[PDB]
Amino acid sequence: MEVIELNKCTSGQSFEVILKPPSDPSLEEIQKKLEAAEERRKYQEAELLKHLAE
């Protein structure tokens, strides 16, 4: 039961008590994912329009 690193100031204080010792995607890559998904949306909408054109 030890207290360490006791720091005190006008608005409070803080310390540490020890009870026992122990024993990314680049900017270019993110644009590809966004544009890839937008392209799959365009393809699905084109098939719908093509279907409606038939």
Add this chain to the structure above:
Amino acid sequence: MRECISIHVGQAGVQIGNACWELYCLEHGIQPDGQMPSDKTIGGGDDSFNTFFSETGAGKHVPRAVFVDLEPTVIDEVRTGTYRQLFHPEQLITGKEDAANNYARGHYTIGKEIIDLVLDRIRKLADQCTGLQGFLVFHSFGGGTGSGFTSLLMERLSVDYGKKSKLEFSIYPAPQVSTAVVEPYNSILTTHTTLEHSDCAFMVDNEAIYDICRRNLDIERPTYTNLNRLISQIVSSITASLRFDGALNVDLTEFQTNLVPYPRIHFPLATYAPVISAEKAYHEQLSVAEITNACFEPANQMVKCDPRHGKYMACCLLYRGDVVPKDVNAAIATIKTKRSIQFVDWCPTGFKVGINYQPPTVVPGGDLAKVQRAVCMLSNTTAIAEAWARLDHKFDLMYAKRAFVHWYVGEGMEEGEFSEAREDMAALEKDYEEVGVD
């Protein structure tokens, strides 16, 4: 002095953000018009509260915050509300139509078209900072914006602000206050793509906040206002060290250093006490031992789970009010002899304690009663993995039938992103079990 930028995403993030900045202002003596009488340095200063507030020549203290929502009705409340004068219009960003509770819609369809604008508005806040620490990101798991757009924003923030910390306040989905059935999908989709970008995330389960409001505050059917005012007390207790003079958790990096020894396991459990009803005749003021002992009761955890059957990796005690170090240790010793507190062997069995002499501020007319002392315990338990298990199970039930999947595929997302995200969660559950179980 180093600045922190807060980002509120979606309805949950924006409304919770509303309650926090309302509370911050009351805590720092800032009026709704931005003026701060106690601030003796007009139009400048490097005081602790300046990490969250900037200052104009006219003496206005402006939050370092951005509010983002794909639909305008929630942020319109901010524009005409009590604190409409705090923020300027550039800080409030709203689209025309929301993500319809569809992760894919917020992340891809709509997010792609507004992400560059959001980064530009954040870059403007960054340009006012002499030493930006990082970001605090508020959002829900269940919403299409809170889930899908947030994960997109986090990816870009890692690109534009590499060396900056990012912490989260995430609302875990609870059916009692949700008419959305696809939230398990969204929760797991946003956890998978945000995991590598968030240094530390504080999950709040609406189920837990809901039952605290009914049990402690005697609210029969709590509202978002009730829930948010309570959540903003926990948030304030967590961010107090950044806004007030102190030596514990003085910068965002310290949260990871003190609470996250392993990167993927960065979801500390929050526990808060006491929560007393203002309508009560008059409550007996609880002692340091009693409020500290309450930190190990499941009934006041932000996530219902049993820490007795997990292991602790870290543990912080954040006290506010009349608390001296002598009494804290007297309560800790009394609790080690009664409670089942099991630490991982590769971690010290101890507690970092912070004490702020200013007691919790309560919103006038709010639900919470003024207390002489309060504590918030941040502990990294493997027991919080119960929430991942509950959520992953609901995911598996719907995905086994592909229910609602077409809504996501129809927005340009591939079906393989589901299993890819689910397999990551299965690995996350495995990491917890390797650390906690024997």
Add this chain to the structure above:
Amino acid sequence: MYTFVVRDENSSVYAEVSRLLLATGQWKRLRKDNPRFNLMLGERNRLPFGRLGHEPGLVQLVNYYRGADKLCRKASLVKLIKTSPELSESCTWFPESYVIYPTNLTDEREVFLAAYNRRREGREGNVWIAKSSGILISSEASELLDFIDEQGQVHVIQKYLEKPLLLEPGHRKFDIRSWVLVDHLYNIYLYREGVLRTSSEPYNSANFQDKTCHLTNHCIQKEYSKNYGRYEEGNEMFFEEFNQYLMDALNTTLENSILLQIKHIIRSCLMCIEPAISTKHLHYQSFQLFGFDFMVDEELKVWLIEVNGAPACAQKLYAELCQGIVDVAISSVFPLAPTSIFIKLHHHH
């Protein structure tokens, strides 16, 4: 209308409880994976406790205490007794035991050999028994350890009661099974009816190789013993007969000579782990039936052998006990539209 689910089809006990529940007309059974339930008759291993108590407007109850395995596991029990100050290492009602890990994997190998060498030098009885979760009784430490190394799981070595109480006629060993029910309020209820699983073979102290007179298990006596069912039907004596025997022979009652120690042991073990497994302030509730096994020596001293977390019942007592489970464990939380069969062991929570 109350709802429950059955996730352990092999449980004879809760198969009858489910039968009784449906017979009331006020309980309805659901598929084993339906989450909207009041009561879960859960599985033995890997019961998903984390998914309980998260259904809005449902008070959920389960028939197992999360964390009770610490008491119902051979190795766990030893560790619990030696490390818990409530029980202490000097616990007088539990045989001297040690945890021994096979050499192909802390471990108490050296601690055991020290106490062993002490008994060997002091002319004292030095007969131990090795078991785990396949039993070996020997008086040589070399055989006990070599036997565990040939396996691949943890084991425990404890003093073998060389002076057991022998029923007459027969000169035969036995053990006592006590069923204990712990409800959601952590009341400890001891079923008024116990059973003695007796050996139909005369106890032989100079031959531990033939384990038919040393192991009183109902399956060993009914498979390897040649006198099964001679003295009592199914090698199962009930308290009425056993009590009458203790009076005719030993001029004492079962309550005084044995039952006091049994109730004391049950209380000590269950009160010890109460802070770790209590569901008092938990989002769900638990109860559990336990099977305590006791040994009685010739001095009328009771020793604790083990605790079973999923025990079966004697065929003659299924109806009474299963009905008692519904009364104090299920209906107490989910009431329906005596002279209790249990003995409430009061204690301080």
Add this chain to the structure above:
Amino acid sequence: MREIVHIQAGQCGNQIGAKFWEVISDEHGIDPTGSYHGDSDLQLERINVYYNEATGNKYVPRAILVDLEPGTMDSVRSGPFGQIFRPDNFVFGQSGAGNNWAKGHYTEGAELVDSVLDVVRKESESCDCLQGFQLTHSLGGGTGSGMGTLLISKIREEYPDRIMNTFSVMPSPKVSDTVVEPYNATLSVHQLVENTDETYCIDNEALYDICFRTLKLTTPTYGDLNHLVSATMSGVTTCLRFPGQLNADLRKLAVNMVPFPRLHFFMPGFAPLTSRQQYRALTVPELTQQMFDSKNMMAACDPRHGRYLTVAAIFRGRMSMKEVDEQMLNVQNKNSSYFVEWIPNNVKTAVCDIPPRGLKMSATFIGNSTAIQELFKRISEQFTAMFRRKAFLHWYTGEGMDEMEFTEAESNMNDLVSEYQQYQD
């Protein structure tokens, strides 16, 4: 500003649509001349969802009235709230459709459709952020069925990402006009399967049995039947027209009600339904029991014969929201065998403080149940009884259709029936 464009087509569609605007115009305080005269700001908070605001504070419904003959729409123009409709939004021909799907879809309807879309486009161009469309029509006639689905097809072509909702009256031999109604309904259902996000299946026999057995109307009229549909349409749209802690958005309702794109046919219900013992107060339990009673549902399908994929419930009036949650959880927790277990928490509830006209409180039911397959089975059986003898086909082959298009509609609906069957097991 989440505007909805309303379209009503044919006799049934315009008479039901007329009453709909009559009911909600009353709820929002709009008089027959479009002038507001209510007393609560709640009435105007979401008023632009269904109304356009003209000069002088005049509110004009965002509705388009379509028919292939003039009679029905002259009645509307002369009806109670006839003057409230924008005169330009009356689009009609003179030929009629002879209860013939082919005439509404391919010949007569095709000549008129472009001019309808011109008005639709005009209404959309004045929407700050168009939320989607709703159509009222029957499936047993010619205009609402044939031209109605033709309009849906062209609307989805021009607004592919907008939500398309229909209130579709399903024919029944007991409340029948002509024998060819199964032909027109089978042909329409396939269109709806492909091109709508939500279809509220309203069965005329269910409406009839309710008026006769429950409301004790000795001789029901179409008028009486339409009163039930008005009240039901007002209930389901309460989410959109008034404020509440729920942020109901057409696409959000669809996202949480439709787990599979083709299974978007709903069973609507309403409670209370009281004969004239009409002043009695209705407790929350009674409201909830009735709302889940099959006799209160308007698809004439027994929900106990299937399982609910999803359920949405709207409670109206000043009541115990706590007591609402209790009774709703009681209904699920007492009959969980009729809800699929692979869609967790699939029963959602919304509350609204403003009750309907003349009621302290009410409850509207929206069920996505696999029992709806019974409704498509009836139609399919009636279709095949005639089609196997090619009876009455000349009315359709005379308009350019071929028998093959009938065989394909037949197979399309038997597939829909099969799809509901696999999710019921």
